[PDB]
Every structure is written in structure tokens, then in C-alpha cells.
């Protein structure tokens, strides 16, 4: 969900 993670 977080666009900066994975």
C-alpha cells in the first residue's frame, strides 16, 4: 500500500 516500500 505504501508507494515508497517494496
Amino acid at each position: 500500500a505504501n508507494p515508497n516500500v517494496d
Epitope: N2, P3, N4, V5, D6
Partner: antibody
């Protein structure tokens, strides 16, 4: 190694526009985003703007959204910030910045900063 | 617009003291909270990410805690080289928001 090199600082008269640039090397801008972050004389860090690798998801801080435009030129590996209607509050060191997290770990990069002074 | 509020604004203590900074987020941010260290005339350096994970090479006296809206950064034994300004930062979405910063100073 990833390197970010900012350019464009110096003195600029109020009301004018200025374009800063950040030449990136060591990676292709094909994932995540890139940011501008600024810091006025002895004040705190202020995130200014972001753009995604595909040119989308452009967002700005409220204080600057009405006057700034972020863009990128991948064929040059270069990030831009265009600041319009320059005013006293824009005097600051401007950093380009890249940050993301993946299974190899955190990745956090900053340019050296370039100082914009708005003055006659 | 998410607001990040750190406290205290300045923190003066002695070498060896345990010191803690708080950060409060005006919305739920899970654990997407980072902590940066900045020394004068330098670019900031990431110290802690996902609220409690340390960057490699960050000394073990640093630690972070919290979730959702209340977060802390602790230095368990303040050392001379820790004098710096410390910023919390949310990264829930495309942009970023920094706290106002905490200047850590040493009394000797």
C-alpha cells in the same frame, strides 16, 4: 554509487522565475519518486515537491503549490524545479532527494544543496 | 495535510544521559515514520526507518519506538558526537512531512 548534483543557485531578484536542476547518476529513474526539500537560514527541513518516475503523482507543499512546478527529463537523468514569483520566503538551501525501501534495505540519497537567495 | 509535531524544540543534557524526543502525527501513519540527523552545513542523514529500524552503522544507543500517531526517538547514553538537529518524517504516501526538528545540545 548513486549521486545527485544540484545546480542553479545564486542570487535572483524577487518576482522572477528560477529553474534548479539535479543531475542524477548510478540509477535509472524507473521506480519510486524524487523530491525537492528546502531549508531556510537556520530553520528546519521543509519538503517541497515530489514527482514519480513516470512523470505522474506530482505533489507540492501548500506554501509553494501555487507557484512551483516539478518535472523530470529521463533522457538526461535530470530532475527540475521551476520556482515562479520568487519571494523572500524562498531563500533557502534546496536539496534533491531520493528515498525508498525494499528487501535489500533502506535507500536514502541527498544532493549537496544549492543556496537560492532572493534579493535585489 | 498531515502535521508532525516534535517535542521539545531544543534539548540540552549531559554526556551519558538517556534522552528522548517525541513526535506526534495528526493522522494515523502506521509505522511509516523515519528519523533524520542533521549537523550544521551538512545534508541530513537517515538514522531510523519504519519507526524502529536502524540504518547500518547507526550506533546501538539510538532507538525508536511507536506506531500510528505517537513516536519517540531515544538516545540511551548521549555522546558528544550526537549534538545535531533531529527531524521526524512521515512517508505514508508520495510526498513527505518533516517535524519542526529538535536541536540536541550538550552541557559539560
Amino acid at each position: 554509487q548513486v549521486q545527485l548534483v544540484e545546480s542553479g543557485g545564486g542570487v535572483v531578484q524577487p518576482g522572477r522565475s528560477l529553474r534548479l536542476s539535479c543531475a542524477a547518476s548510478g540509477f535509472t529513474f524507473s521506480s519510486y519518486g524524487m523530491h525537492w526539500v528546502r531549508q531556510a537560514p537556520g530553520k528546519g527541513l521543509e519538503w517541497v515537491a515530489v514527482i514519480w518516475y513516470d512523470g505522474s503523482n506530482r505533489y507540492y507543499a501548500d506554501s509553494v503549490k501555487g507557484r512551483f512546478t516539478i518535472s523530470r527529463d529521463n533522457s538526461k537523468n535530470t530532475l527540475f524545479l521551476q520556482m515562479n514569483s520568487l519571494r523572500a520566503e524562498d531563500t533557502a538551501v534546496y536539496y534533491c532527494h531520493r528515498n525508498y525501501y525494499d528487501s535489500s534495505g533502506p535507500f536514502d540519497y541527498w544532493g549537496q544543496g544549492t543556496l537560492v537567495t532572493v534579493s535585489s | 495535510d498531515i502535521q508532525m509535531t516534535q517535542s521539545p524544540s531544543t534539548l540540552s543534557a549531559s554526556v551519558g544521559d538517556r534522552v528522548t524526543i517525541t513526535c506526534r502525527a495528526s493522522q494515523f501513519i502506521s509505522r511509516w515514520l523515519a528519523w533524520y540527523q542533521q549537523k550544521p552545513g551538512k545534508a541530513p542523514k537517515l538514522l531510523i526507518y519504519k519507526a524502529s529500524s536502524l540504518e547500518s552503522g547507526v550506533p546501538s544507543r539510538f532507538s525508536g519506538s511507536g506506531s500510528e500517531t505517537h513516536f519517540t526517538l531515544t538516545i540511551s547514553s548521549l555522546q558528544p558526537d550526537d549534538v545535531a538537529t533531529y527531524y521526524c518524517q512521515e512517508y505514508t504516501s508520495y510526498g513527505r512531512t518533516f517535524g519542526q526538528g529538535t536541536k540536541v545540545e550538550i552541557k559539560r
